[PDB]
Structure 1
């Protein structure tokens, strides 16, 4: 668990991420569906609230929704069940 702090696209580290899922494919689909929910919530905030809710962690200034979703998964804030 000792390294330099990762920077750019590699934060959070994938080898530490992967203990939350079973396999890389499931992790990819996990993050992509969460990012679709995030972007739908961001686009649909002008009117009344839809069934999707929020970046559960606080984002940066201009942060990509996929990166927000990955930090959520690393934050141990979601749960899922495969097909």
Structure 2
């Protein structure tokens, strides 16, 4: 709801992220897959959100998930 600006890796807030995933494990694998895709693109889809100066792939993937720019499924 109302909170101070998150710092470090607490940004984006975990509650918003979990609102877009079935559980913590699903979010973890979702972010990991997106980060691996971003790194593979870096070393030959690229990052959608404008990456920072030297933002790591994982942070970019988390920001993309927070922005709702991506989607996922659960194979089983």
**What range is the shorter-chain TM-score in?**
over 0.9
Q: Which runs of 4+ in 1 moved over 3 A?
A: none
Q: Tell whether 2:29 aligns with 1:37.
A: no
Using the alignment, how far apart are the partners of 1:26 and 1:43 within structure 2?
26
Of 34, 51, 62, the residue aligned with 1:59 is 51
Query: Cα RMSD between the aligned structures?
Result: 0.5
Alpha-carbon distance, 1:15 to partner: 1.0
5+ residue gaps, structure 1, are: 45-52
Higher helix fraction (1 or 2): 2
Cα deviation for residue 79 of structure 1 reads: 0.8
Query: TM-score scaled by structure 2?
Result: 0.96
TM-score, with normalisation over the residues of structure 1?
A: 0.88
**SS of 2:39 mapped into structure 1:** helix
Give the 3-state SS of the residue equivalent to 1:60 in structure 2: coil
Cα deviations across residues 40-64 of structure 1 (Å, max 9, x unaligned)?
Answer: 00011xxxxxxxx110110000001
